Design a protein around this ligand. Structure first.
Ligand code: HEM
Ligand code: HEM
Ligand code: HEM
Ligand code: HEM
Lengths: 146, 141, 141, 146
């Protein structure tokens, strides 16, 4: 991936400040509310009928934590994003049949969550480094289609 | 179709942006230019560096177009009609680029309006920007 | 917005599809199922194999919805309103899938209407299908 | 890429029948008419004001021939599509700044041209093998972004 030292610096420092127990679920919840079709994949999660009901859902919060887990794994391995996500690719592509466009959506949603939590600290160049990251991850996660 | 809840949330958030509307528009553009460099080719004659007067000037004009869309949310096609002609016919702007700028506009609000950017308001803002983008790409001939 | 030329081309091509409309709809779906297997998950209970009665049955229902859209091309939102509710609310169909089916519908016409599928008619058909897709995704709540 | 022997068979046999002097320009012309924004990249080509004017443009026809040239090069190398297109990736991504979505559009347009020229012979399974090909090429051509 095309990450420069300065880009690597922006990402890692911000990521150190990330509340990894909540930001993951904050992002999944937002995906479910903003792009409601994605709820099709989470019919077993229980009450998804309102925004408040989605964000306050412990299964969403628990599952987003796992999602964020995978991003953090991505951040230690921008040399081999393809291999790190290969198992997750198999699962989402061959087992779940999630259209890969949704991978870019959740990445963009994450970025919105980061901006929201960090404000002025999520500068345009800081956003730039993070768009390369989520793009990178979305593309690796979609390898089983390519 | 934008829901009555959507109109209410968008109105509320734009009201809270207040007089920063222009500065916010400038910042969205820069975010777009940095995050998605392909978009830069529509502005070869702009100086796109940080603090560019032209970017700022454009940030206000773009922000004013959005407030005009908000103020006429029930007839955006009519309100954005000239702008639609400009973006599709003259400039030939790629429909993808409206998604990239919309995302950056969401990021900008998120970064400035901590209280206002709730999951619901985020959803409503997103549909508003998709609606505006639909109108601005309606005139591909 | 669909141009008067567009309406004329779409009308002309649908007129030339004639009574094959249903069979064409079935073939578009199969093309979609084969080319983009992700789309298959909305039809787990259908038999998607070649010559499926259910696919055929669905091909006609889908084709009839399109001719109804053509016949009311100036008020598609009203005509496709119930269908819009179904696709967005109940089925939760991914907006991407409308692009995949639209492409396959274009491929199907191309494969059956050599004379009618001119570059212009192709452009008009494409905008028609984008318009129909916009209406069918208008009700995401 | 995920091409089976039967898929390879459908592609190659049809491709042998392709009029490589015209199908390339037929596809580029259609792209220019169907997705008019792409004309932004061909302002030097002359008269692009009508569909007939676009299809009958010798520069479009000449340039599409080159485009089709690259696909045929792709078809002999589905093992290494990434490396075959690397130079074309640099050009379209770093020099031209064409959004990669347009690569998928032209691929889809090609498929429509193939259906149009071959009819009943471009069967749904034949289309399926070709969608994997154009997807593969669009993704390789977009490598310089990923
Ligand atoms: C960058 C994007 C994504 C990442 C990093 C990601 C990551 C993950 C992870 C780490 C798991 C847990 C797997 C396990 O327990 O071993 C998972 C499961 C799951 N994901 Fe995602 N995911 C992404 C996108 C999506 C999207 C967009 C959807 C649907 C709209 C989705 C649907 C699901 C579902 C339904 C499961 C549970 C399936 C099961 O338990 O078998 N994923 N994902
Ligand atoms: C919500 C979306 C958008 C809105 C509301 C908007 C609004 C505007 C407005 C108000 C103008 C000024 C018209 C004038 O001064 O006469 C303008 C011009 C322009 N726009 Fe946008 N626009 C949007 C999206 C885009 C995108 C996505 C691009 C390209 C990536 C773009 C490229 C341009 C260019 C190149 C100009 C002319 C600038 C110049 O030559 O000085 N616009 N737009
Ligand atoms: C031009 C685009 C489309 C049109 C005109 C259309 C039209 C229709 C019509 C007329 C019905 C029958 C309603 C009824 O029988 O009550 C239907 C049902 C359905 N549609 Fe579509 N549709 C379109 C796109 C899509 C796409 C892209 C998908 C998924 C990839 C999809 C998935 C479904 C499903 C799963 C059903 C219910 C079938 C069943 O459960 O028996 N539709 N649609
Ligand atoms: C699968 C997709 C594509 C393929 C295989 C392809 C292939 C090619 C080839 C073989 C050339 C000639 C390069 C040379 O002379 O060495 C070329 C040039 C060019 N392409 Fe494409 N292309 C694709 C998509 C696109 C799209 C979608 C656009 C614009 C909308 C585009 C814009 C251009 C332009 C403007 C040139 C001329 C640039 C120059 O001469 O420096 N290409 N492409």
């Amino acid at each position: 991936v095309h990450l420069t030292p300065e880009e690597k610096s922006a990402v890692t420092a911000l990521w150190g400040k990330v509340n990894v127990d909540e930001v993951g679920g904050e992002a999944l919840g937002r995906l479910l509310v903003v792009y409601p079709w994605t709820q099709r994949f989470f019919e077993s999660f229980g009450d998804l009928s309102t925004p408040d009901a989605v964000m306050g859902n412990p299964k969403v919060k628990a599952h987003g934590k796992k999602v964020l887990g995978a991003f953090s794994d991505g951040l230690a391995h921008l040399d081999n994003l393809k291999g790190t996500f290969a198992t997750l690719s198999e699962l989402h592509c061959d087992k779940l049949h999630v259209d890969p466009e949704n991978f870019r959506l959740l990445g963009n949603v994450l970025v919105c969550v980061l901006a929201h939590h960090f404000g002025k600290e999520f500068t345009p160049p800081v956003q730039a480094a993070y768009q390369k990251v989520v793009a990178g991850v979305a593309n690796a996660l979609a390898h089983k289609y390519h | 179709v934008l829901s009555p809840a959507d109109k209410t949330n968008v109105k509320a958030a734009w009201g809270k942006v207040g007089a920063h509307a222009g500065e916010y528009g400038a910042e969205a553009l820069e975010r777009m230019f940095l995050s998605f460099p392909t978009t830069k080719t529509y502005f070869p004659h702009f100086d796109l560096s940080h603090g560019s007067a032209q970017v700022k000037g454009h940030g206000k004009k773009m922000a004013d177009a959005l407030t005009n869309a908000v103020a006429h949310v029930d007839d955006m096609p009519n309100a954005l009609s000239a702008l639609s002609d400009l973006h599709a016919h003259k400039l030939r702007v790629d429909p993808v680029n409206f998604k990239l700028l919309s995302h950056c506009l969401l990021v900008t609000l998120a970064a400035h309006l901590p209280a206002e950017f709730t999951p619901a308001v985020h959803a409503s803002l997103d549909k508003f920007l998709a609606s505006v983008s639909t109108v601005l790409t309606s005139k591909y001939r």
